[PDB]
Structure 1
Amino acid sequence: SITENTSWNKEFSAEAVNGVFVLCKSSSKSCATNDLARASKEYLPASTFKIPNAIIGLETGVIKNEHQVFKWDGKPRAMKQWERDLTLRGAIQVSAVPVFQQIAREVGEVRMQKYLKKFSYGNQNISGGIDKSWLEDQLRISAVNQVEFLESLYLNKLSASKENQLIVKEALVTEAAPEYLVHSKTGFSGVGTESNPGVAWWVGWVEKETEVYFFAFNMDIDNESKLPLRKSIPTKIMESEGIIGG
């Protein structure tokens, strides 16, 4: 069940942002959103795609184990933060596109296609994903589908070993307090054009005391200065629902 809360639009209008937030307590069967239509609309996943990419890398043995170090060969990378050796967690946390492109190359299109179908991941399209593409038809996923996928991961219910799901889960931890734990992942497809904007994401789940909340946020973005809104708008809505971190 999903309830539209139009009162949640105030956080978007205050920042002059077009976007959607989906928040669910306990399971994907109890959810609220500011916009029902946009909650089901599919968008480029951008770096949020590193979550299934990492599970598939481990399932296929392309990622040898939890402790594999992805060595920097010294060749130029698009972001300075990627020009270094990275663990699987580090590569996910800094959104290291080149590490995941090499994993996707080794997995191959046949196995990547097979696993996106097994995971019910978005439109399950073979194109884009970890690669930059201007194809009209490429991988896209809705905020509702992100919550469903993340709930499956949280419950170790994806078509993958529980061990591999647990490895990716610890790699996604972004805040740890005794009774407050956040797993999350950002994405940003690029500012696009003023008429054809890019998308920014923040997806994850929060374990507060004995409760769990799943969330997925996306927004249209045509100016990179607006990128921090992908965390501040959802953080404000979650604080209004009593989900408050340190």
Structure 2
Amino acid sequence: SITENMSWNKEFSAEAVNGVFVLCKSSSKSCATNDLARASKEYLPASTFKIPNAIIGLETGVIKNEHQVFKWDGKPRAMKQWERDLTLRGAIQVSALPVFQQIAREVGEVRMQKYLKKFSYGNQNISGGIDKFWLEGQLRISAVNQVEFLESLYLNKLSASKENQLIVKEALVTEAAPEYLVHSKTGFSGVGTESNPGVAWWVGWVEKETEVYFFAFNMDIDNESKLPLRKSIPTKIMESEGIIG
């Protein structure tokens, strides 16, 4: 089940943020959130979709192996951070959209649709273009669904080889310590339109000693100056819960 902790809304009100944090100890059957209504509301996954897309890319053979280098041959890209050769992990961690847009094209509608059904990934709507359905198309996923999906990944229970799940998991390590390990992925759909804000994400899980905590955060956003809030608000909530001080 899931519990509503209204105390957590303090971290949101202090910054006038409309968002939701979902936090789960040990498993998906012991979770809490600041907002039950928004916890199950479905939003564009934006770059958080690079997690399933990479798994599907390895499954289908589009990504030959974990050692494949995605070369940059000089085609101008929307951010200089993407204008370089990238590993699979690098492409994920810098959110190299063009790399994963080409992966999407090579996977194709049929295989993409099949794996999203197998992963129970959101509304499973890939309309809007095979290389943009997760960013400006019709794909939507809730914070609870992200936690469920990531828990499956952590347990190697996605319908894919354990090998490929493990490959993507190390690619998601963002903080490493002897008894403290974080897998996570951020997302940002843009600033949105007039009275249609964008969405920003932070999702992943934390392994502290022999315990695990899955989490998913999203917020409405209409300016890039608010991006750091997608990390600081959830980090403060987790710090409050003793998930490392």
Further displaced range: 154-163 or 122-131: 122-131
SS of the residue aligned with 1:137? coil
Question: Which runs of 5 or more structure 1 residues have no equivalent in the other structure?
Answer: none
Aligned residues: 245
Q: State yes or no: 1:9 paired with 2:9.
A: yes
CA shift for structure 1 position 91 = 0.2
Q: What TM-score does the superposition give when structure 2 sets the normalisation length?
A: 0.97
Tell me the alpha carbon deviations over residues 122-166 of structure 1, each in whole angstroms, 9 at most, x when there is no partner.
000012588446999700000000000000000000010000000
> Is contact 2:105-2:131 (8 Å) kept?
no
CA 1:142 to 1:57, structure 2 compared with 1: closer, same or farther past 3 Å? same
Equivalent position of 1:90 in the other structure = 90
Tell me the alpha carbon deviations over residues 32-65 of structure 1, each in whole angstroms, 9 at most, x when there is no partner.
0000000000000000000000000000000000
Matches within 5 A, 1:77-226: 77-128=77-128, 131-132=131-132, 138-226=138-226
CA 1:176 to 1:137, structure 2 compared with 1: closer, same or farther past 3 Å? closer
CA shift for structure 1 position 194 = 4.4
Tell me the alpha carbon deviations over residues 88-128 of structure 1, each in whole angstroms, 9 at most, x when there is no partner.
00000000000000000000011000000000000000125
CA 1:192 to 1:133, structure 2 compared with 1: closer, same or farther past 3 Å? farther
> Is contact 2:45-2:134 (8 Å) kept?
no
Q: Report the Cα distance in structure 2 between the residues aligned to 1:209 and 1:135, rounded to whole angstroms.
A: 36
Q: Report the Cα distance in structure 2 between the residues aligned to 1:189 and 1:131, rounded to whole angstroms.
A: 14
CA 1:5 to 1:107, structure 2 compared with 1: closer, same or farther past 3 Å? same
SS of the residue aligned with 1:70? coil
CA 1:117 to 1:134, structure 2 compared with 1: closer, same or farther past 3 Å? closer
> Is contact 2:45-2:135 (8 Å) kept?
no
CA 1:137 to 1:94, structure 2 compared with 1: closer, same or farther past 3 Å? closer
Q: Report the Cα distance in structure 2 between the residues aligned to 1:15 and 1:108, rounded to whole angstroms.
A: 41
CA shift for structure 1 position 238 = 0.2
Tell me the alpha carbon deviations over residues 3-54 of structure 1, each in whole angstroms, 9 at most, x when there is no partner.
0000000000001000000000000000000000000000000000000000
Q: Report the Cα distance in structure 2 between the residues aligned to 1:163 and 1:238, rounded to whole angstroms.
A: 30
> Is contact 1:49-1:130 (8 Å) kept?
no
CA 1:41 to 1:153, structure 2 compared with 1: closer, same or farther past 3 Å? same
Q: Report the Cα distance in structure 2 between the residues aligned to 1:97 and 1:80, rounded to whole angstroms.
A: 12
Q: Report the Cα distance in structure 2 between the residues aligned to 1:180 and 1:134, rounded to whole angstroms.
A: 31
Q: Report the Cα distance in structure 1 between the residues aligned to 2:172 and 2:156, rounded to whole angstroms.
A: 14
CA 1:130 to 1:14, structure 2 compared with 1: closer, same or farther past 3 Å? farther
CA 1:23 to 1:197, structure 2 compared with 1: closer, same or farther past 3 Å? same
> Is contact 1:194-1:222 (8 Å) kept?
no
> Is contact 1:151-1:214 (8 Å) kept?
yes
> Is contact 2:49-2:134 (8 Å) kept?
no
> Is contact 2:21-2:234 (8 Å) kept?
yes
CA 1:136 to 1:100, structure 2 compared with 1: closer, same or farther past 3 Å? closer
CA shift for structure 1 position 193 = 2.3
Tell me the alpha carbon deviations over residues 178-212 of structure 1, each in whole angstroms, 9 at most, x when there is no partner.
00000000000000024100000000000001000
> Is contact 2:129-2:137 (8 Å) kept?
no
Q: What TM-score does the superposition give when structure 1 sets the normalisation length?
A: 0.96
Matches within 5 A, 1:50-65: 50-65=50-65
User: Identity of paired residues, percent?
Assistant: 98
Q: Report the Cα distance in structure 1 between the residues aligned to 2:176 and 2:239, rounded to whole angstroms.
A: 17
> Is contact 1:55-1:165 (8 Å) kept?
yes
